[PDB]
Amino acid sequence: STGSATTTPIDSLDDAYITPVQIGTPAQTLNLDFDTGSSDLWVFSSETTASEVXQTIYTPSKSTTAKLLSGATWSISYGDGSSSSGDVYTDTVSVGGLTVTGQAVESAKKVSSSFTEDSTIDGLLGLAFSTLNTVSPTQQKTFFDNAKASLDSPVFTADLGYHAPGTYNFGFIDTTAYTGSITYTAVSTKQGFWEWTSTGYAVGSGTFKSTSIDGIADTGTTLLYLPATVVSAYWAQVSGAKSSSSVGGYVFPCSATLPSFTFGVGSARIVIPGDYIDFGPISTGSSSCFGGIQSSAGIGINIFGDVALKAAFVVFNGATTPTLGFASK
């Protein structure tokens, strides 16, 4: 079996991408944020505190299949400070035709203020390694851990687009979606993340510097968070650039042609086009823009978010000994 779905930016800043999922019998279609930096399938539901609800809600009582994982509960916190918890049901879930039975669907009783204000995101689909699932007392396999045994190939692919639709493939590798070949690189699961190590970086037409950079592929993260020295090296080529404490990071004139960024993958090189990095005006009408690359020093973990991921065709190979593929497009 295989599944294919379209993935859409929730705005003109690619702040995030939503992907329709069909939960329960009959189908209840929800827009979910596929988040590889985590491992939980949770959704706004009839159980969610009303006043916290502004989103398409999941009603398990309208599902014939939906069961109640008795005595089970989940709570989770994210980098941005957001959070949510509630209880768990087992129900049928289908993503781009791919149908999985008995997939644990976490029902939100409560959701932090951030989500509630997020109208376009009905919930998230965790695609990290199961060990990071928050359900208690027994953890629940992700959508991907559950589909593996029925997939043609234990791989899923994220082909995110720059200010345009992209795609999530499950079980197969579309050789038409990318160019050249795919270079695979080790993945450490010690943290339960898709954690690999980049062989280095370059700024524009400058020299590639071999320097180890341990980070994670997190589609559920908007920007590119790298060590400080690296980041600064980049903006140092950008004249109007400067670090802004009030805005919270590196800004630069919206009229500056930004240099491309290159991160090594094995002996391979993925080039992030300058344009991608020019994230967007700090506010509508401003002539000051916000950079897509920022220091990871605050998060305490290097993260290749959508600014990097969307510049390549990525392969999350869920075989016994996982690997992360990377190819240009």
Partner: peptide
Amino acid sequence: HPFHXIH
């Protein structure tokens, strides 16, 4: 309007 997903 950056997004930042477990801790």
